[PDB]
Amino acid sequence: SQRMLSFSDALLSIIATVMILPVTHTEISPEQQFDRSVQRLLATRIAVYLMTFLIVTVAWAAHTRLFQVVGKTDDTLALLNLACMMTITFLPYTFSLMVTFPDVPLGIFLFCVCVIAIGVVQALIVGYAFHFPHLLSPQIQRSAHRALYRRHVLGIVLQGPALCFAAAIFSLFFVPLSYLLMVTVILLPYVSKVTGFDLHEPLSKERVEAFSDGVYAIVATLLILDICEDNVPDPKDVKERFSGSLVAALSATGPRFLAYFGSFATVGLLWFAHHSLFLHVRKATRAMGLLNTLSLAFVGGLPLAYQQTSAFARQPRDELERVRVSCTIIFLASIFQLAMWTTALLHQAETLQPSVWFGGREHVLMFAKLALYPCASLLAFASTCLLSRFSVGIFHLMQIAVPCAFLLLRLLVGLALA
Amino acid sequence: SQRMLSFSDALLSIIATVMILPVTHTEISPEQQFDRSVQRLLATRIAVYLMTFLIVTVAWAAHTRLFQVVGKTDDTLALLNLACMMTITFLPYTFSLMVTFPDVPLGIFLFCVCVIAIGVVQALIVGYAFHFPHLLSPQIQRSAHRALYRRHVLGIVLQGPALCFAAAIFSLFFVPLSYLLMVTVILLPYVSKVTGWCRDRVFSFDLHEPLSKERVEAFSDGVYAIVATLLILDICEDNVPDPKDVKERFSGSLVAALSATGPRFLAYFGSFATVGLLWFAHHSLFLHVRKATRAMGLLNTLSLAFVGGLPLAYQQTSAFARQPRDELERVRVSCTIIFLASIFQLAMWTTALLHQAETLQPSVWFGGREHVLMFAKLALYPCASLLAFASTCLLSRFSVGIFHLMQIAVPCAFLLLRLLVGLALA
Ligand SMILES: [K+]
Ligand SMILES: [K+]
Ligand SMILES: [K+]
């Protein structure tokens, strides 16, 4: 039913951040001046993770549309969806393999086989669907119609794997330069025919909500995912710390614990802003999901920043650029959430059900609730005008503290009306 | 007004499974003769994982009971729930610290402090709720009542942290020999109030009720996805062919150095199939469950535990460790794992037990429309696992592969394998 999408999107959420693990798992230890090559590696892994989320979310969106055109499902449909998931989950690893092995044919060959498989599987789940129009087709407009939808939906589903088969036969047998014929497989679902039926309708609100909640949950506890399996003090530590006194050898994990606490607090607060926004969103538009994807990507990036902030690498005097990085990451991951909300200029009639319209009941409330994080990150970014850059700690402390008394911070403006 | 609970349990799922990472991350290679030490370490880690899942699941049950005794949600309530989720997230690491340091009082102290944390924030949640009846009360039952429901729910929420307070002070009182008050914390809200003593005096329900079907459904989906992709986490993060490999494999030819991950590649390719099939059985079952009783969730917890255990089994099967002639018993253990993880599902099913009036809405009753279909779809896995367990009757133990391939294959033709019995009626 609609429940089968819950698992098949929680799985996609947890597969959309599988490539974030090597970002945090790599060390930033100053043991060598290799910081040049280490940074060359960190930027590579970041560019691999950001091109993984933005290649899994589009698959998730094609999948969510296809399951929006097959609304009611049964056993065989659940099996075919499971197969489609088994194929989609192979996207991050194979994409990493292709990026790390560019000039070798097998890499992009496997990546294009990986996308061809999910394409043909979805084609199967839509053919089996349209062979049972009474049972599995969504509604009357898709049930009783010209019955010509099959052609258009098969096209919109198979264009991915077909363009891919083209890019694969052209891939590296000759001229491995036109494999941009692959990178154009992402634009067509998002926008190519909009500027160049109507199955291109915006996603369902519940689906993007569940995906965002999944990717917030995983990226919050991503730190505790290793602070638990690494920082067990290893009772052989009796020789370490010159003595026993478990608290002594445990205090070594103090920086990582202060990194976690902050990372989870910030990710949970960003999730709270996202949830207070999506609680009033009536019908998530296309631009809504487009902004949400990037917001989620930078949120997924965030834990690396929070880890780098609470590290004490060498020459830690002119290396205060770490707070600049950990603040620009927050400023991106939250300014995109704020853009999601400010995309209500004239769509407020359709979207944003009338409780937060221009001059609504709690308009300023949610507005400032969402704009609280970009401004708070900007305030810390402004540390370039002073030297006490450690103010980031106290600032994010009061930041987390605000949303409690922030109903009354709004009453402050209410009384400032006069 | 309930998406917050969805996020809370989708986070509690990964927090529950966080302790399964070191089990799979262990070294199964026997390249050094240390089978005894590695086996003891693996047993230790499995025990820690099982205890961790049990404690996090009982904490999650308490949390969902509380958030069922409060229907609506406010911003302050959302922040309090976030603090609760953080404090309860800190449970697995602290429990591992305690189990690896039982004699030192610091571990038990930190664990019962991590209880005195969550517990107290749930007390604060329910206090804030009862200070706003017309706003955050669940239904007219709690809205219009004697208002001693607060006096009862504070008790049922704080009786745990109080026991942990006692355990923590006994930890440093002298010789913490007992230290078992945490077991009493785990055991009381399940059996004690149901059997030992109840409090009353006007009183309808909602002391400790069966969990909401949506909550346990979302938790099961979370953990199932988390394992099915737990194997892919490792295969994706730690098996990049390292372009330095131009010296490795004695040549280039990326397929050469890529075939090295083949064993664990197919291991994941089978583990995902099996875990997804188990989830499909769960989804088919819970689609007809009307009102999941308490024993239903109790059995579902153990089912999820052994499901989370499964990846270790599927890694053990596809291993080619030293002396691979008499060590075939990897298939034995990996089959008992599946057998448990699915027979608990079958037991959740067989908890119909004339409760068809309440549970199992009238489509799967004795003599229902497809009761035989549901029974077979749920019992396909334990029966096939026992068939593979029967490998002890011969030597061709490799039959596990073909039999599990057939297991995946059956539910595609299940609607006709049931028609087989339908025609066999005559
Ligand atoms: K979920
Ligand atoms: K998850
Ligand atoms: K994970």
Curated annotation (Swiss-Prot), chain B:
The reaction(s) this protein catalyses: H(+)(in) = H(+)(out); K(+)(in) = K(+)(out)
Residues flagged as site, Hydrophobic filter residue 3-1: 21
Result of changing residue 3 to A: Impaired potassium channel activity
Signal peptide range: none
Alphabetized UniProt keyword annotations: Endosome, Hydrogen ion transport, Ion channel, Ion transport, Lysosome, Membrane, Neurodegeneration, Parkinson disease, Parkinsonism, Phosphoprotein, Potassium, Potassium channel, Potassium transport, Transmembrane, Transmembrane helix, Transport
Effect caused by changing residue 315 to L: Increased potassium and proton channel activity
Molecular-function GO term, any one: potassium ion leak channel activity
Compartments where found: Endosome membrane; Lysosome membrane
Annotated phenotype, changing residue 234 to N: Abolished potassium channel activity without affecting proton channel activity
Stored InterPro entries: TMEM175-like
Annotated segments matching region Short helix H2-1: 33-39
Site (Hydrophobic filter residue 1-2): 226
Complex formation: Homodimer. Interacts with AKT (AKT1, AKT2 or AKT3); leading to formation of the lysoK(GF) complex, which activates the channel. Interacts with LAMP1; inhibiting the proton channel activity of TMEM175. Interacts with LAMP2; inhibiting the proton channel activity of TMEM175.
Comment text on domains: Composed of two modules of six transmembranes, forming a homodimer with a tetrameric architecture. The six transmembrane regions of each module are tightly packed within each subunit without undergoing domain swapping. Forms a central ion-conduction pore lined by the side chains of the pore-lining helices. Conserved isoleucine residues (Ile-14 in the first module and Ile-226 in the second module) in the center of the pore serve as the gate in the closed conformation.
Protein name, entry field: Endosomal/lysosomal proton channel TMEM175
Organism of origin: Homo sapiens
